[PDB]
Amino acid sequence: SLVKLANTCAHLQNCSKVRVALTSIPYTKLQLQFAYNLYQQGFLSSLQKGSTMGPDKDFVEVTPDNISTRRLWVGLKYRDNKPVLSSCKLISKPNSRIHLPMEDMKKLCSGVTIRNIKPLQPGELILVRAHNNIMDINEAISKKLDGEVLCRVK
Amino acid sequence: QKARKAMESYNELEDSLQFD
Amino acid sequence: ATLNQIKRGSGPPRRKKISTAPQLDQCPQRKGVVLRVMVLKPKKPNSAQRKACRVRLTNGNVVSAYIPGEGHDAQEHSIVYVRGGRCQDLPGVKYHVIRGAGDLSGVVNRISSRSKYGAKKPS
Amino acid sequence: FSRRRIAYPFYPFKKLGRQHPKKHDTNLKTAMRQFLGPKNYKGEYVMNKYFTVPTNHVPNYIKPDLERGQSLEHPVTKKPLQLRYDGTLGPPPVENKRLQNIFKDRLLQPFPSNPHCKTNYVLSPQLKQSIFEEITVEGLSAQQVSQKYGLKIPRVEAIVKLVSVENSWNRRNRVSSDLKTMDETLYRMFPVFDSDASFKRENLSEIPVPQKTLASRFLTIAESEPFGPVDAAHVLELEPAVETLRNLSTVGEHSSGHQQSTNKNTKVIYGELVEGERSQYKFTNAKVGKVGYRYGSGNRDNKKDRRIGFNKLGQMVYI
Amino acid sequence: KEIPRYENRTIYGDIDFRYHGVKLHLRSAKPGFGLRVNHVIFEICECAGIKDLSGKVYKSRNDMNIAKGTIEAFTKAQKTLDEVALGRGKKLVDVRKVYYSS
RNA sequence: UAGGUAGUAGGUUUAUUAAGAGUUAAACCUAGCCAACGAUCCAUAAUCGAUAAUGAAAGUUAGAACGAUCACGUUGACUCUGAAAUAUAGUCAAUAUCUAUAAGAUACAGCAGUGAGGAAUAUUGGACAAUGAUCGAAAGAUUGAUCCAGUUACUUAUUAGGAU
RNA sequence: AAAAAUAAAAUCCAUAAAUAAUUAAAAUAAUGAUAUUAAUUACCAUAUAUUUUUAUAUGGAUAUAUUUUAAUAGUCCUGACUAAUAUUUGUGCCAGCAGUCGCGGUAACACAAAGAGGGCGAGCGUUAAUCAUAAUGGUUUAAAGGAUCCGUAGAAUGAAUUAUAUAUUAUAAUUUAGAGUUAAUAAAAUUAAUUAAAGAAUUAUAAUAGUAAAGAUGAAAUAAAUAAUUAUAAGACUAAUAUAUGUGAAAAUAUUAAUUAAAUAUUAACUGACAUUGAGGGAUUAAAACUAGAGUAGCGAAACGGAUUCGAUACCCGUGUAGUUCUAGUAGUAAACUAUGAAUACAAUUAUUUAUAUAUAUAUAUAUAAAUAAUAAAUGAAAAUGAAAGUAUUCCACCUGAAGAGUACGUUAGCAAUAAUGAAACUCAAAACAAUAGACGG
RNA sequence: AAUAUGAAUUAAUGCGAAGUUGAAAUACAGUUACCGUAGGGGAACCUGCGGUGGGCUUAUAAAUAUCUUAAAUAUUCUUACA
Ligand SMILES: [K+]
Ligand SMILES: [K+]
Ligand SMILES: [K+]
Ligand SMILES: [K+]
Ligand SMILES: [K+]
Ligand SMILES: [K+]
Ligand SMILES: [K+]
Ligand SMILES: [K+]
Ligand SMILES: [K+]
Ligand SMILES: [K+]
Ligand SMILES: [K+]
Ligand SMILES: [K+]
Ligand SMILES: [K+]
Ligand SMILES: [K+]
Ligand SMILES: [K+]
Ligand SMILES: [Mg+2]
Ligand SMILES: [Mg+2]
Ligand SMILES: [Mg+2]
Ligand SMILES: [Mg+2]
Ligand SMILES: [Mg+2]
Ligand SMILES: [Mg+2]
Ligand SMILES: [Mg+2]
Ligand SMILES: [Mg+2]
Ligand SMILES: [Mg+2]
Ligand SMILES: [Mg+2]
Ligand SMILES: [Mg+2]
Ligand SMILES: [Mg+2]
Ligand SMILES: [Mg+2]
Ligand SMILES: [Mg+2]
Ligand SMILES: [Mg+2]
Ligand SMILES: [Mg+2]
Ligand SMILES: [Mg+2]
Ligand SMILES: [Mg+2]
Ligand SMILES: [Mg+2]
Ligand SMILES: [Mg+2]
Ligand SMILES: [Mg+2]
Ligand SMILES: [Mg+2]
Ligand SMILES: [Mg+2]
Ligand SMILES: [Mg+2]
Ligand SMILES: [Mg+2]
Ligand SMILES: [Mg+2]
Ligand SMILES: [Mg+2]
Ligand SMILES: [Mg+2]
Ligand SMILES: [Mg+2]
Ligand SMILES: [Mg+2]
Ligand SMILES: [Mg+2]
Ligand SMILES: [Mg+2]
Ligand SMILES: [Mg+2]
Ligand SMILES: [Mg+2]
Ligand SMILES: [Mg+2]
Ligand SMILES: [Mg+2]
Ligand SMILES: [Mg+2]
Ligand SMILES: [Mg+2]
Ligand SMILES: [Mg+2]
Ligand SMILES: [Mg+2]
Ligand SMILES: [Mg+2]
Ligand SMILES: [Mg+2]
Ligand SMILES: [Mg+2]
Ligand SMILES: [Mg+2]
Ligand SMILES: [Mg+2]
Ligand SMILES: [Mg+2]
Ligand SMILES: [Mg+2]
Ligand SMILES: [Mg+2]
Ligand SMILES: [Mg+2]
């Protein structure tokens, strides 16, 4: 759900403003892939599965009995009195989805505004979804993949 | 007319003094 | 507006200057015949006896044209050429007559800006 | 704020006082006569320090800021002379310290307000002959001579071309005394090039800056991932910059690597020439869809960007 | 105040800053691009040492609030490459600079 | 301009055509078809480009010039020939003019030119030398296509004197 | 530092044109309209050397030299936007100028000129036109949230896992977090419609004794009483509680009871995305108004009178018709207001109530929601908003300077008043909001 | 029947100057203003009915207060004592 992803992006911005160290997001495959990319790119300190009440200390198998109570817990980073994850916005919106070929993704990473999408800025992460997998735009260009430009994180 | 436009000439005149 | 409202017509209004000489019918100038020469009083805070003229254009439109320059020899039945341009202090006078065209002569003894007053170059 | 400003000298000068009614002089004209000094009966300005050319390979460029407008000196002793109350020229009261230790860079800077413009070094008549004899006789490559004397390859190729013209001129006695006099005078006005002097040597690593690369792309990679010029070249989809430099050094006609044969693959026919025919037909194979004048092409003749060219005879022709 | 400058000539990336009624959109530019911005921003860039910049001011164009907004944008809306790298624990490479390196 | 449509929407068959189809004509059935994402109606307009103008760009404007396409040759309909024409043909009628007064001829949106209208747009020019087109076996003939020149700062470009 | 001005003349050296010779190319088998061809060369020709080019020497050709020879730009502008500092004259709100702001009433940088100056330049200016010049927008208070909700289309949007496919979509299976169904348990007595009752007072009438003034107002005057105690009749209204708290989609809703309908929380089970929003459409919708029939105490447009006033078509007083009430309808409008559409996810605190639950050493304590108040952050033109007017997403409505105008015309609907829909021309460079400091306030 | 033109005839409105008759609005504007609707009046406006605040949140006391070693002891103290 792109709506759920929009909710998460707005949630992370709200948490950054108040500087909470730990927050939770909905437990779904898309959310987990989104969070994992942020973690590997250095935007998130930690990524743990858990429940509505907090991160799990020991592994808890997820089943239909507890799926409704599952959450993903992410740790936010702050350095030099500045939040590392300041902004998080969707590019492809629920009411206007954007699919780009690899050629147009290369132009976006080269300073060209494609379909009103502002080009990639220094230190910014743009995520792309291809065949239900989320990857950095630079990785999609390396794999010659065409995909939906989901969001940009800075 | 007096108040508003009088300063246009004086404030440019202030800049005249700057070169002086 | 929402994305669907934009799809249905919603959008920013366009900016393009509007015509201020509708009676010319998108022509640089139109010939006309002076119906009556008149003297009009500027709107305040201006004071003067502004010379104007009512003119019937070759397209049937009747307009009020300002006669520029000091002194004019325009009369009734005189052939005049009317161009765009309003007289700011005279409401309803939206046009100018061209000096040195038709039966309207150039300004007598004009030295500066002669081309604007139909004055030929002195030898 | 802006107003018309008569270009009065920035430095102090003797302004006009009370004037006889028929002089009709200007403060600009009197400031110029003070800069120029007296004019002799021969029409010369001997007191001006710029009237005569330097003869020691050191350019005499104007230094109004450092001399504060004092341009007069003794024509033989080169000792400063300034205007006095009597209306005569004499020694200045205090020596000018700004004119005795001038930076080396300033000496080569002709325009006071632009320090990014410097004169070039003149090559001595000996270095030119050496370069000419090495490329032509010894058979060295322009890349070698360029890397030896610290001269850019185009300049090296130009020296060979010009020395060839000087040999033909000297072989037909076309270099007159006046030309020799002028050449020597101009030679003694510029700093001579020294191949050994490191600062005088021309940079040999310059490459044209492309446009696609002029933008600033940034990549976020692992903290310990190595990224070097070759990786950057792949990202920008350009040949390595070192390769560009090497390909630019093999362009000289006498440089190594100069090659042009991949184009000798176009069938050409030279039509039969018969006695009495004033011209020969040359046919060049082409491909339908590429050859021909296109239909409905933009006419630019009535536009500001109309294409203007020059034919083999040098005559201006519309393209 | 000190303002971060990328290569001592331009800003780091693009800036979309709102200062009261002034909407400032500033974009970094290539070397030799010059200053193509509101005249108020031009003077500030000249004093600060910014040589290449593009931008557009929307909504309010009050000179006073453009100047203050610009100063604030140069400080609160910029992040150096070094600061981004340290915060994320990643290496950030300027591809254009590496292309001309040894 | 909110309802529109009655060959109208669909089915079957014949006629017609090289050929599909309510395309046209005839017959018989079904009750459909279009429409507030704008039907029907009215007004306006020749359309477009790798053309021109403008803008950072998306676009916007023009549609003269170059090129592509369509329509028309005073107006309407019809017919003949033909692969193809409601032909700048023929027939009849309409409007205007003309002379030969005939069931007549002409219609400059071919070139030049004239009057009119308009703010405003040119020579009643030269040549078939070139490139094409038509006729001819050829020799050749014809060509206001075309190529040239004339008029007009309408546009563009170059030049319209340097040193002292 | 007031220049005009290296500007002029003059000096040096050129080229164009002319003149002379020569002469391509468009075209060749031949044919040239253009054409008095372009170009080249400067006595012509030739030889040698000679990037080019140059140079020497030769044959003929004139008197040691060898055809001649130049250079007259216009147009707009100089207060600001907008480049134009060297000043001066005439005019005096006249004459005139003007794209915008404006200029001119005797020291005019703006009009008409001189001087000087700034543009562009065989063009310059001007008019008519095209493109660009802010939505990288808004709607509490400035243009702009539909009165309200229900719900159709939506070529609008919308959960989870897995597997395929031709892939942000489709299909299948599976799942329960959204959305619903039923029951259990606890809680509450409101909101609709209907029926049945109660209450204080008011007015009228009659009686009673008892009198002579009463009533009204700023003060006045107009129209066996007033007051008191009884009895009777009629219509309308609903004191305290009470905060419209709460409830209801909004409009609305507070004397009592009853009938019918709807409405809360938690738990259990169940369905398995069945949801959100909602053009058109539908329904409801204060007061006034209208149609028909009843009612009519009090109040009260109008009308008629009394006052006030210089006047008083008013404010105040009297008499008081429609109306206000009920029944059955029409109509669909309000500052129908929170001047703020609905839904979902989310974000830092305190206080106060309410609800549910938990515990006990039984009355507090601990929890989780809701409401309200004051705030952090954030937002904002600010005033302020504060769980939205914050951070985001989805859908609908609406706005594009003022005035003209919610007008005109047409259409649709209505018994009618009217309601909905809804322009253009002309004119102007205004117009509006928040906030600041004053002034003023019966 | 439509489109266009003129049109007897007739409706609305703007600007300009410029007086006149009142004093309706902005302060408690001297009767709170405005919204909807109805009636009336030279004109603004007046009156009835409900609504709104873009007017009254502009909101600010019926007062009353207590016992342990006042010092040879707390008050001093400078890295000390412990
Ligand atoms: K239509
Ligand atoms: K034409
Ligand atoms: K021919
Ligand atoms: K000039
Ligand atoms: K607002
Ligand atoms: K309530
Ligand atoms: K399912
Ligand atoms: K729906
Ligand atoms: K609706
Ligand atoms: K009554
Ligand atoms: K309200
Ligand atoms: K809505
Ligand atoms: K009033
Ligand atoms: K009212
Ligand atoms: K009223
Ligand atoms: Mg003028
Ligand atoms: Mg200026
Ligand atoms: Mg058929
Ligand atoms: Mg049909
Ligand atoms: Mg039939
Ligand atoms: Mg047409
Ligand atoms: Mg077009
Ligand atoms: Mg054309
Ligand atoms: Mg078109
Ligand atoms: Mg044409
Ligand atoms: Mg035809
Ligand atoms: Mg025809
Ligand atoms: Mg015909
Ligand atoms: Mg004709
Ligand atoms: Mg013709
Ligand atoms: Mg005419
Ligand atoms: Mg001919
Ligand atoms: Mg010549
Ligand atoms: Mg020939
Ligand atoms: Mg004067
Ligand atoms: Mg001016
Ligand atoms: Mg003047
Ligand atoms: Mg002058
Ligand atoms: Mg030109
Ligand atoms: Mg735009
Ligand atoms: Mg809104
Ligand atoms: Mg509302
Ligand atoms: Mg409203
Ligand atoms: Mg549930
Ligand atoms: Mg009584
Ligand atoms: Mg009560
Ligand atoms: Mg409440
Ligand atoms: Mg709904
Ligand atoms: Mg009744
Ligand atoms: Mg009364
Ligand atoms: Mg109703
Ligand atoms: Mg109404
Ligand atoms: Mg309304
Ligand atoms: Mg209400
Ligand atoms: Mg709902
Ligand atoms: Mg109406
Ligand atoms: Mg205000
Ligand atoms: Mg009054
Ligand atoms: Mg009043
Ligand atoms: Mg009042
Ligand atoms: Mg009354
Ligand atoms: Mg009232
Ligand atoms: Mg008030
Ligand atoms: Mg208030």
Do E88 and A121 make contact, defined as CB atoms within 8 angstroms? no
Dihedral of alpha carbons C12, C14, C15, C19, sign: negative
Alpha helices in C1-123 (DSSP H): 3-7
Determine which of A37, A84, A116 to mutate to test the interface with E (most E C-beta atoms within 10 Å): A84
Tell me the CA–C1' distance in angstroms for D287 and G33: 37
Token pair recorded at residue D296: 């409905």
Reported as type and span, the H/E element at residue C57 is strand C50-57
Measured between CA atoms, the residue of chain B closest to residue D5 is B19
- Name which CATH class applies to E15-94: alpha beta
First and final CA of chain C: distance in angstroms?
Answer: 68
Q: What is the nearest nucleotide to A70, using C1' and CA? A: G177
Do E81 and A84 make contact, defined as CB atoms within 8 angstroms? no
Is residue A146 within 8 A of residue A102, CB to CB? The reply is yes
Do D3 and B13 make contact, defined as CB atoms within 8 angstroms? no
Q: Return the closest-CA partner of residue A37 out of A104, A88, A98.
A: A88
Give me the C residues in range 86-105 that sit within 7 A (CB) of strand H. 91
Measured between CA atoms, the residue of chain A closest to residue D221 is A41
Dihedral of alpha carbons E46, E48, E49, E55, sign: negative
A40 residue type, one letter = Q
Determine which of B7, B14, B19 to mutate to test the interface with D (most D C-beta atoms within 10 Å): B19
Subunits next to E (3 or more Cβ pairs <8 Å) are A, D
Token pair recorded at residue C108: 């007598």
| Residue A5 burial class via C-beta count within 10 angstroms: exposed 0-12, middle 13-18, buried 19 and up | buried
Residue C62 forms beta bridges with which residues? C56
Do D217 and A138 make contact, defined as CB atoms within 8 angstroms? no
Dihedral of alpha carbons D33, D35, D38, D40, sign: negative
Residue D279 beta carbon within 7 A of nucleic strand F? no
Token pair recorded at residue D54: 């330097």
Is residue D100 within 8 A of residue D133, CB to CB? The reply is no
Do A41 and D219 make contact, defined as CB atoms within 8 angstroms? no
In Å, how far from its chain's centre is CA A118? Answer: 18
Residue nearest to nucleotide G28 (CA to C1'): D277
Cis omega before residue C45 (within 30°)?
yes
Q: How many CB atoms lie within 10 A of CB A54?
A: 12
Q: What is the nearest nucleotide to C24, using C1' and CA? A: G128
Query: In Å, how far is E16's CA from the nearest CA of chain A?
Result: 11
Q: Which nucleotides of F are covered by protein (CB under 7 A)?
A: 49-53, 65-68, 117-120, 155-158
Q: Return the closest-CA partner of residue A24 out of A2, A48, A41, A42.
A: A48
Is residue A107 within 8 A of residue A100, CB to CB? The reply is no
Measured between CA atoms, the residue of chain E closest to residue D235 is E95
Do E90 and D233 make contact, defined as CB atoms within 8 angstroms? no
Residue D302 beta carbon within 7 A of nucleic strand F? yes
Is residue A38 within 8 A of residue A80, CB to CB? The reply is no
Partner-chain residue, chosen from E93, E99, E101, that has the shortest CB–CB distance to D218: E93
Q: How distant, in Å, are the alpha carbons of A55, C36, C48, C84, D169 from that of C104? A: 95, 14, 22, 17, 74
Is residue D112 within 8 A of residue D100, CB to CB? The reply is no
CA of E41 to the centre of ligand 50 (A): 72
Reported as type and span, the H/E element at residue E24 is strand E22-27
Chains B and C touch each other (3 or more Cβ pairs < 8 A): no
Tell me the CA–C1' distance in angstroms for A11 and G387: 15
E-chain residues near A84 (CB < 8 A)? 87-88
A70 residue type, one letter = R
Give me the C residues in range 66-85 that sit within 7 A (CB) of strand F. 81
Reported as type and span, the H/E element at residue C63 is strand C62-66
Is residue E95 within 8 A of residue D219, CB to CB? The reply is yes
User: CA A22, CA A34: separation in Å to the nearest integer?
Assistant: 17
- Which single residue is written with the structure tokens 């080396």? D104
Partner-chain residue, chosen from A42, A118, A122, that has the shortest CB–CB distance to E88: A42
How would you classify residue A144: left for phi > 0, otherwise alpha for psi between -120 and 50, otherwise beta?
left
Helix, coil or strand: residue B15? helix
C-chain residues near A96 (CB < 8 A)? 3
3-state secondary structure chain D: CCCCCCCCCCCCCCCCCCCCCCCCCCHHHHHHHHHHCCCCCCCCCCCECCCCCCCCCCCCCCCHHHHCCCCEECCCCCCECEECCCCCEECCCCCCHHHCCCCHHHHCCCCCCCCCCCCCCECCHHHHHHHHHHHHHHCCCHHHHHHHHCCCHHHHHHHHHHHHHHHHHHHCCCCCHHHHHHHHHHHCCCCECCCCCCCCCCCCCCCCCCCCCCCCCEEEECCCCCCCHHHHHHHHCCCCHHHHHHHHHCCCCCCCCCCCCCCCCCCEEECCCCCCCCCCCEEECCCECCECCCCCCCCCCCCCCCCEEECCCCCEEEC
Q: Return the closest-CA partner of residue C40 out of C65, C76, C17.
A: C65
D-chain residues near A138 (CB < 8 A)? 219
Pairing of strands D82-83, C62-66: unpaired
Interface check for C7 against chain A (CB to CB < 8 A): the answer is no
Is residue D315 within 8 A of residue D297, CB to CB? The reply is no
Q: E33-50 burial by CB neighbour count: b if 16+ within 10 A, else e?
A: bebebbebbeebbeeeeb
Q: D254-266 burial by CB neighbour count: b if 16+ within 10 A, else e?
A: bbeeeeeeeeeee
User: CA D283, CA D303: separation in Å to the nearest integer?
Assistant: 34
Backbone angles phi, psi at D221, to 5 degrees: -120, 175
Q: Return the closest-CA partner of residue D105 out of D114, D118, D96, D121.
A: D118
Residues 6 or more apart whose CB falls under 8 angstroms from that of C75 comprise: C34, C37
User: CA D135, CA D259: separation in Å to the nearest integer?
Assistant: 18
First and final CA of chain A: distance in angstroms?
Answer: 22
- Which single residue is written with the structure tokens 């039966």? C103
First and final CA of chain E: distance in angstroms?
Answer: 35
3-state secondary structure E47-64: HHCCCCEEEEEEECCCHH
3-state secondary structure chain A: CHHHHHHHHHHHHHHHHHCCCEEEEECCHHHHHHHHHHHHCCCEEEEEEEECCCECCCCCCCCCCCHHHEEEEEEECEECCEECCCCEEECCECCECCEECHHHHHHHCCCCCECCECCCCCCCEEEEEECCEEEEHHHHHHCCCCEEEEEEEC
User: CA A12, CA A18: separation in Å to the nearest integer?
Assistant: 10
Is residue A154 within 8 A of residue A86, CB to CB? The reply is yes
Q: Return the closest-CA partner of residue A49 out of A39, A60, A65.
A: A60
User: CA A112, CA D212: separation in Å to the nearest integer?
Assistant: 12
Mark which residues 1-20 of B lie under 8 Å from D by CB.
Answer: 12-16, 18-19
User: CA A33, CA A15: separation in Å to the nearest integer?
Assistant: 20
Measured between CA atoms, the residue of chain A closest to residue D222 is A41
Residues 6 or more apart whose CB falls under 8 angstroms from that of E80 comprise: E4, E12
- Gaps in chain E after residue (C–N beyond 2.5 Å): none
Interface check for C3 against chain A (CB to CB < 8 A): the answer is yes
Token pair recorded at residue D249: 């050094």
Q: What are the extents of the domains in chain E?
A: 15-94
Reported as type and span, the H/E element at residue E74 is helix E63-76
Give me the C residues in range 33-92 that sit within 7 A (CB) of strand H. 41, 43-44, 91
User: CA D34, CA D72: separation in Å to the nearest integer?
Assistant: 9
Chains E and A touch each other (3 or more Cβ pairs < 8 A): yes
Q: Return the closest-CA partner of residue D255 out of D135, D97, D130.
A: D135
Q: Return the closest-CA partner of residue D69 out of D102, D92, D38.
A: D92
Helix, coil or strand: residue E40? helix
First and final CA of chain D: distance in angstroms?
Answer: 48
Residues 6 or more apart whose CB falls under 8 angstroms from that of A10 comprise: A88
Query: In Å, how far is D228's CA from the nearest CA of chain E?
Result: 6
Residue nearest to nucleotide G159 (CA to C1'): A1
Give me the C residues in range 27-46 that sit within 7 A (CB) of strand F. 27-31
User: CA D197, CA D201: separation in Å to the nearest integer?
Assistant: 7
